[PDB]
Design a protein around this ligand. Structure first.
Ligand SMILES: [Mg+2]
Ligand SMILES: [Mg+2]
Ligand SMILES: [Mg+2]
Ligand SMILES: [Mg+2]
Ligand SMILES: [Mg+2]
Ligand SMILES: [Mg+2]
Ligand SMILES: [Mg+2]
Ligand SMILES: [Mg+2]
Ligand SMILES: [Mg+2]
Ligand SMILES: [Mg+2]
Ligand SMILES: [Mg+2]
Ligand SMILES: [Mg+2]
Ligand SMILES: [Mg+2]
Ligand SMILES: [Mg+2]
Ligand SMILES: [Mg+2]
Ligand SMILES: [Mg+2]
Ligand SMILES: [Mg+2]
Ligand SMILES: [Mg+2]
Ligand SMILES: [Mg+2]
Ligand SMILES: [Mg+2]
Ligand SMILES: [Mg+2]
Ligand SMILES: [Mg+2]
Ligand SMILES: [Mg+2]
Ligand SMILES: [Mg+2]
Ligand SMILES: [Mg+2]
Ligand SMILES: [Mg+2]
Ligand SMILES: [Mg+2]
Ligand SMILES: [Mg+2]
Ligand SMILES: [Mg+2]
Ligand SMILES: [Mg+2]
Ligand SMILES: [Mg+2]
Ligand SMILES: [Mg+2]
Ligand SMILES: [Mg+2]
Ligand SMILES: [Mg+2]
Ligand SMILES: [Mg+2]
Ligand SMILES: [Mg+2]
Ligand SMILES: [Mg+2]
Ligand SMILES: [Mg+2]
Ligand SMILES: [Mg+2]
Ligand SMILES: [Mg+2]
Ligand SMILES: [Mg+2]
Ligand SMILES: [Mg+2]
Ligand SMILES: [Mg+2]
Ligand SMILES: [Mg+2]
Ligand SMILES: [Mg+2]
Ligand SMILES: [Mg+2]
Ligand SMILES: [Mg+2]
Ligand SMILES: [Mg+2]
Ligand SMILES: [Mg+2]
Lengths: 197, 193, 191, 136, 172
RNA sequence: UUUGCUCCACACAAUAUAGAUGGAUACGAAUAAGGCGUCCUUGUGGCGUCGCUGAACCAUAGCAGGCUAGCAACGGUGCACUUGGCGGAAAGGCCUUGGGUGCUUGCUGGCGAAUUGCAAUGUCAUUUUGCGUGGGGAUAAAUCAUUUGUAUACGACUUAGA
RNA sequence: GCAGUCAAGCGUUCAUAGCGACAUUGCUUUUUGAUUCUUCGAUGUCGGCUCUUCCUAUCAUACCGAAGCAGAAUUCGGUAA
RNA sequence: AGAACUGGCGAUGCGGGAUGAACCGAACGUAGAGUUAAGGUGCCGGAAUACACGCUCAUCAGACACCACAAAAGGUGUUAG
RNA sequence: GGCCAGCAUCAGUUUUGGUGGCAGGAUAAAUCCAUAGGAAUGUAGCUUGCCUCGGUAAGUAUUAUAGCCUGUG
């Protein structure tokens, strides 16, 4: 659709966000994912906490270096869920992965760029209301991630600025509407009506 | 954490400048010569760097160096190093350090008597070492063929790999250690019989 | 079998003005005010008049319906807590070593400080919660009295103290020592 | 200090609630909820629009804020009588929803030429509004 | 087994020289086609009479359309079913608009709640419950209460593109 | 070591491309609830309104977009200059000022287009590099060998030397 | 070898604190058997020494529930490698 | 370990069962276009994040024949009888 | 007439749509119309008891100031 798709992670389901991201990549669609720390996983926090520790215990016995690597950060968790959906050892595999970029919080470029959502991964649309689920941030911070507080902090500060930007825009689009209204009832306006506009 | 500026003093002791080189004698000693210019203009560009620090900067450290010439050592080439600054406020912190550019700081202004301090240093070296002294492994019995400062079983059959846990001959010494709780019994003073 | 609608009533007295947006509940009456967060629950509130509020659950399961009443319950207690208020009484119990209870404060604290429990050279402490206030009773021996607008904040502060004097390593039927919640009620009397 | 309890005021399944059928031979047509079968099925009838009396799953229909007098389980003729009586059609007609659906239907039916002239018009509008938007 | 039709089937025991005109028996049979429904007929008959398809004949097979296809009805339903451990009789009540609809959901409900596949179920009787308050099972009474209405809270639009630009709204 | 380095500029030349072909079009939060407008007592406030998809919004006509005239506007936009200010999460971008200049399809005119032959992507992007020219700027070091021993199997480490 | 279910009994009294007959359902693969699939142009035996790591059906240590737990001691159970 | 009848493997690739002598499907000259079998269709990965009714929330859920195990016995979890 | 294409008309194979005429059946079943009878998740009216001048409630009341059900045609 567009050269880059920035996805606001907040309110999405890891494995469903993953699954759609994978495909997009494999079809040429560069993606960047933001706020991976506001990502969800079905199931109570504790469950996924244990699920994570299960992953934790697997290591190359003779050398825990060569063995499986346990990335704690929400984006990195995400990549795992995603990478596992890509034949990432083909060249085609590596190729696709590279159009992808995951991020806790929303850092520059992307903040001023617009972000979208993936309805078929949107928790509030998918999960049966009543079911329990998990945020990535709390999970990750629970298994070592060192940076929840800073991201929250930087973001609140981002959110301040952006909420100005909006009010300022909302202000302008009131005028624009006001301008448009005086042009209502003109010949040209009735014409465009007539043609569906 | 990321470093976002370093602001430097104007005049730099040769002693430190020496640390910025591998071949002092031959070299034209041009280190920091352009940087010192940045002072000439009123102050202009150094202020904004200090300024920059103040506006951002969650922590502030100072670059100090040792006066190795006041020391019986032959080594001449001083030791430069960052020290975090823990007194009040970011701003006052960089105010402080700007005040101490070129100016000199005293031991007794950091340590008091009977204070518990820790010591961070690179351990004495010993080079290549047998398993027996490097790991404090039992001596093998005297009767044994092919040597006895060894470990008899380097591993069971599976996992079919020597493992990261078992002891092996290797380097010993020249290790970093942060060792703690050393109480200060004297804070000496040089100008003092 | 998914019940098509079941609802409850939350009665409102001549002193208070409960207000609820999203599912944030503010109850405000003579004794102050409490608020409590219900978002976790999926019920629908409905004013009918300044003395009545309905809360209901559409097409719900057993577990859902079952949480309907406990919301009526929870919100009720905010209303009474802000009208009558709550007052939990505990009375010390000891068969030799006089449990000695005091209130202390490090860094603007208020701590319930228990000394000599079964003699323990150890000095037990329990923070006083905010909302809850504590009079050692005149006229009644070894009685401690906790009181506030939040049932849940006085009951918990009570239970913190009662527990901190659990007995280890003894037959706890013969060693009945402790501080025990001895009466639960309201602050305003006649009722 | 009155009380202020939100609302959350849903459209309801009930006899005489009009629904827009969303897929099927009918689809796009309105119709009325007659009887009510279970939590997921309802009996509909939309005489004025051609849609056959039928059972249908609520999931295939979208509720509209429109309602009228309908005897529960009232047969097709009765349905038609009441409906015209209630003038539901021009009611829905006048709504934004319907006016919106109408719009995109027109947009969709434009000639390439018509399309080209839509542009010339937008340029024209755009000129005097961007002007307006700069004199106050 | 599929989407049902309801058939009358009439079979009758090949005549014999000494007994021409045998007795003629009918069964209403729910099945998705006549090849199945005839088969079911012979199934149940051999469970009641000395016969087998071999020695009998079908006389007629006819589909029986719902009398009032767009009228809502409360059905009582009577099933003999087989479980893993033993066999069981059962009474369910189904509310829909044709007997054929109702037999379709029954078969599902039995599959879902009791893990009863089609082979293991006998429909014993399906009959329209005339007077309400002869409706017994509550999950049906629920839908007979005057001036009844209900919301369908938490709406979910099926997105048609992978990406949305809004952020949705389960309002309704 | 044969006039080498660097930044800006254009020029030639190579070499490429995980895949331009109107526009990645910025609140936040909730979803058993919200956006917007308006009003007020500025609140968990009143009143109006919207959703049911971006099927939108913006842009879009001119030799792949030529050469030209005029009118009505005083608007829009590209460009290089300039004013004041914001942005350190990877700020490397955003906003505001003022004159200059181009274009304007807002409207009305004059010319041009063919033969690329009935289609042939019919070439309009952006990567890195090399070589001259001249518009600014800048004039180091590391290695060997020698040497110390806070180091060392050899390399490595750590000193020292106009 | 280890762990259950039923509960007649045992335990002054009292089935189940702690035990538990007659039965009966299991698990385990450091017992021994049964098998003979791989190795007979060769996979170095028993034990000890040394050293690492793993299992838990936990002997100790941490925190707990139970007792035919007064105290002390002990026993049963849980989270625990 | 040993018989009966057939079909197979051995002697046989090809599609499916991730993997695999014997299961499912189907038996091979070189190829084009079509349709399928067994088995599939969120992503890996061709192919509906299809439709429909229920059920199920597991602090070691479950997830498709051969097949890569679980039983007696219990539950005031929930479902229908 | 060497190479490679484009389109047209056809042929073999095939895939995917639009549309016309018929035959069955309870000569579909329904809706619809007519007609008889009925009931309640009882419409009008009536009664009665509170209730800010009617609205509620609980009684009668079978088409009235809604309608539905069943059979027959
Ligand atoms: Mg900088
Ligand atoms: Mg040695
Ligand atoms: Mg030793
Ligand atoms: Mg030692
Ligand atoms: Mg040893
Ligand atoms: Mg020897
Ligand atoms: Mg004990
Ligand atoms: Mg004891
Ligand atoms: Mg019938
Ligand atoms: Mg490439
Ligand atoms: Mg609103
Ligand atoms: Mg507003
Ligand atoms: Mg409001
Ligand atoms: Mg828009
Ligand atoms: Mg032009
Ligand atoms: Mg022109
Ligand atoms: Mg970036
Ligand atoms: Mg040059
Ligand atoms: Mg030496
Ligand atoms: Mg017995
Ligand atoms: Mg006893
Ligand atoms: Mg006895
Ligand atoms: Mg036994
Ligand atoms: Mg053993
Ligand atoms: Mg053997
Ligand atoms: Mg051998
Ligand atoms: Mg061999
Ligand atoms: Mg050998
Ligand atoms: Mg060997
Ligand atoms: Mg292990
Ligand atoms: Mg254990
Ligand atoms: Mg006893
Ligand atoms: Mg325990
Ligand atoms: Mg261990
Ligand atoms: Mg372990
Ligand atoms: Mg076979
Ligand atoms: Mg052979
Ligand atoms: Mg074969
Ligand atoms: Mg294969
Ligand atoms: Mg398998
Ligand atoms: Mg994969
Ligand atoms: Mg696919
Ligand atoms: Mg089976
Ligand atoms: Mg069982
Ligand atoms: Mg059960
Ligand atoms: Mg050709
Ligand atoms: Mg042809
Ligand atoms: Mg036809
Ligand atoms: Mg009516």
């Amino acid at each position: 659709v567009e050269p880059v798709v920035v996805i606001d992670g907040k309110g999405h389901l890891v494995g469903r966000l993953a699954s759609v991201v994978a495909k997009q990549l494999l079809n040429g669609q560069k993606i960047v994912v933001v706020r991976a720390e506001e990502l969800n996983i079905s199931g109570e926090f504790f469950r996924n906490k244990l699920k994570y520790h299960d992953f934790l215990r697997k290591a190359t016995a003779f050398n825990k270096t060569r063995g499986p690597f346990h990335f704690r950060a929400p984006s990195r968790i995400f990549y795992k869920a995603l990478r596992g959906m890509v034949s990432h050892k083909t060249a085609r595999g590596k190729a696709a992965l590279e159009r992808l970029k995951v991020f806790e919080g929303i850092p520059p470029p992307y903040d001023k760029k617009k972000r979208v959502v993936v309805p078929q991964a949107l928790r509030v649309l998918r999960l049966k209301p009543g079911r329990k689920y998990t945020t990535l941030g709390k999970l990750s911070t629970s298994v070592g991630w060192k940076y929840e507080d800073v991201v929250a902090k930087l973001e609140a500060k981002r959110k301040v600025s952006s909420a100005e930007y909006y009010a300022k825009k909302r202000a302008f689009t009131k005028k624009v509407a006001s301008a448009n209204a005086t042009a209502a009832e003109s010949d040209v306006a009735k014409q465009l009506a007539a043609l569906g506009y | 954490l990321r470093s976002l500026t370093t602001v430097w003093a104007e005049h730099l002791s040769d002693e430190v400048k020496r640390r910025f080189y591998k071949n002092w004698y031959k070299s034209k000693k041009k280190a920091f010569t352009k940087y010192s210019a940045k002072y000439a203009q009123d102050g202009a560009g150094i202020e904004r760097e200090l300024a920059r620090i103040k506006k951002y900067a969650s922590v502030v450290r100072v670059l100090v160096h040792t006066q190795i010439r006041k020391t019986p050592l032959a080594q001449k080439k001083a030791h430069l190093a960052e020290i975090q600054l823990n007194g009040g406020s970011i701003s006052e912190k960089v105010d402080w350090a700007r005040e101490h550019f070129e100016k000199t700081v005293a031991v007794d202004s950091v340590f008091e008597q009977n204070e518990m301090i820790d010591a961070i240093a690179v351990t004495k070296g010993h080079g290549f070492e047998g398993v027996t002294h490097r790991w404090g492994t039992k001596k093998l019995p005297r009767k044994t063929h092919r040597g006895l400062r060894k470990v008899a079983c380097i591993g069971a059959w599976h996992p079919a790999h020597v493992m990261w846990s078992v002891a092996r001959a290797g380097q010993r010494g020249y290790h970093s250690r942060t060792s703690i709780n050393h109480k200060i019994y004297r804070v000496g003073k040089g100008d003092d019989e | 079998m998914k019940y098509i609608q079941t609802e409850q009533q939350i009665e409102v007295p001549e002193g208070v003005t409960v207000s609820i947006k999203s599912r944030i509940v503010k109850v405000v009456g003579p004794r102050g005010t409490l608020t409590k967060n219900l978002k976790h629950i999926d019920v629908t509130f409905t004013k009918v008049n300044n003395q009545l509020i309905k809360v209901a659950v559409h097409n719900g399961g057993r577990k859902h319906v079952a949480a309907l009443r406990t919301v009526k319950s929870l919100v009720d207690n905010m209303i009474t807590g802000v009208t009558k208020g709550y007052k939990y009484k505990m009375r010390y119990v000891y068969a030799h070593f006089p449990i000695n209870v005091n209130i202390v404060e490090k860094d603007g604290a208020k701590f319930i400080e228990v000394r000599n429990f079964l003699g323990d050279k150890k000095i037990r402490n329990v923070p006083v919660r905010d909302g809850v206030t504590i009079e050692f009773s005149t006229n009644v021996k070894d009685e401690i009295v906790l009181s506030g607008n939040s049932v849940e904040d006085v009951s918990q502060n009570a239970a913190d103290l009662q527990q901190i004097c659990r007995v280890r390593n003894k037959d706890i039927r013969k060693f009945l020592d402790g501080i025990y919640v001895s009466h639960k009620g309201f602050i305003t009397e006649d009722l | 200090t009155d009380s202020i309890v939100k609302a959350s005021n849903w459209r309801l399944v009930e006899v005489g609630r009009v629904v827009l059928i969303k897929k099927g031979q009918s689809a796009g047509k309105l119709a009325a909820i007659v009887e009510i079968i279970d939590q997921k099925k309802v009996l509909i009838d939309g005489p004025k629009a051609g849609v056959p009396r039928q059972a249908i799953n609520l999931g295939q229909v979208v509720l509209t804020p429109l309602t009228f007098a309908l005897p529960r389980g009232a047969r097709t003729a009765t349905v038609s009588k009441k409906w015209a009586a209630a003038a539901v059609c021009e009611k829905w007609a006048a709504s934004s929803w319907a006016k919106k659906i109408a719009q995109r239907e027109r947009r969709a039916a434009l000639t390439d030429f018509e399309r080209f002239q839509v542009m010339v018009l937008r340029k024209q509008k755009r000129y005097t509004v961007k002007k307006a938007l700069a004199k106050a | 087994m599929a989407h049902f039709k309801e058939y009358q089937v009439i079979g009758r025991r090949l005549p014999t020289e000494s007994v021409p005109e045998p007795k003629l028996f009918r069964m209403r049979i729910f099945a998705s086609n006549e090849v199945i429904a005839k088969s079911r007929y012979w199934y149940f008959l051999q469970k009641l009479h000395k016969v087998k398809k071999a020695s009998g004949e079908i006389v007629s097979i006819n589909q029986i359309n719902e009398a009032h296809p767009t009228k809502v009805k409360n059905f009582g339903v009577w099933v003999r079913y087989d479980s893993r451990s033993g066999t069981h009789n059962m009474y369910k009540e189904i509310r829909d608009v044709s007997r054929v609809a109702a037999v379709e959901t029954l078969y599902q409900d039995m599959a879902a709640r009791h893990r009863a596949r089609f082979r293991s179920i006998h429909i014993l009787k399906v009959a329209e419950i005339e007077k309400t308050a002869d409706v017994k099972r509550q999950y049906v009474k629920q839908f007979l209460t005057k001036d009844l209405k209900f919301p369908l809270p938490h709406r979910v639009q099926k997105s048609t593109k992978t990406f949305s630009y809004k952020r949705p709204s389960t309002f309704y």
